[PDB]
Amino acid sequence: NTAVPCPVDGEWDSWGEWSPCIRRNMKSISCQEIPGQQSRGRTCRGRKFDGH
Amino acid sequence: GSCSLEGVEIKGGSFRLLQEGQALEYVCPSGFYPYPVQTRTCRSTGSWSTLKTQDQKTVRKAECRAIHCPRPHDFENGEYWPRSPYYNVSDE
Numbered sequence A: 001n002t003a004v005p006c007p008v009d010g011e012w013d014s015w016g017e018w019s020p021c022i023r024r025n026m027k028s029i030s031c032q033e034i035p036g037q038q039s040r041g042r043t044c045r046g047r048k049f050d051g052h
Numbered sequence B: 001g002s003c004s005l006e007g008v009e010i011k012g013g014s015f016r017l018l019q020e021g022q023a024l025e026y027v028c029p030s031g032f033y034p035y036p037v038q039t040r041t042c043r044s045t046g047s048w049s050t051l052k053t054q055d056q057k058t059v060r061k062a063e064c065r066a067i068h069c070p071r072p073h074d075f076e077n078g079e080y081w082p083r084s085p086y087y088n089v090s091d092e
């Protein structure tokens, strides 16, 4: 019995929800021909004890 | 979003909204100029840009001040008269 816990590598979470599609200084771009940008987030969950 | 129009009015004048409310322009009467800032940009924090001078001094309230012609601070080989700290309109 060694009293040191082993490293565990973190695993990826699922992909989040897509952010609202806007453009800077372009009011609301809904139902128009104005291309915007949107984002999505993940979370590295589970890395403990100097894991990868 | 559009900036809030609170605390942005000027003492002795009005304003008009340009660039779809993303910039205000102060409208002082004839013979006055808006103190330092002529216009204000709408920064995306809810508040407008601060009343910064050319020396970057924070002015709290804005006011239409009188228009002065630039004073002669240098003149050689003669004498000009009268000397004044500032010159109002229609001075000779």
Ligand SMILES: *[C@@H]1O[C@H](CO)[C@@H](O)[C@H](O)[C@H]1NC(C)=O
Binding pocket: B084, B086, B087, B088
């Ligand atoms: C110009 O106008 C100001 C405004 O009050 C006044 O005080 C001053 O005496 C006037 N004349 C000159 C020469 O500055």
Ligand SMILES: *[C@H]1O[C@H](CO)[C@@H](O)[C@H](O)[C@@H]1O
Binding pocket: A013, A014, A015
């Ligand atoms: C997000 O992207 C795809 C699903 O669209 C998969 O590779 C996985 O579920 C990931 O979390």
Ligand SMILES: *[C@H]1O[C@H](CO)[C@@H](O)[C@H](O)[C@@H]1O
Binding pocket: A016, A017, A018
């Ligand atoms: C963003 O993209 C689509 C919606 O257009 C879906 O697969 C999901 O809601 C994702 O978050």
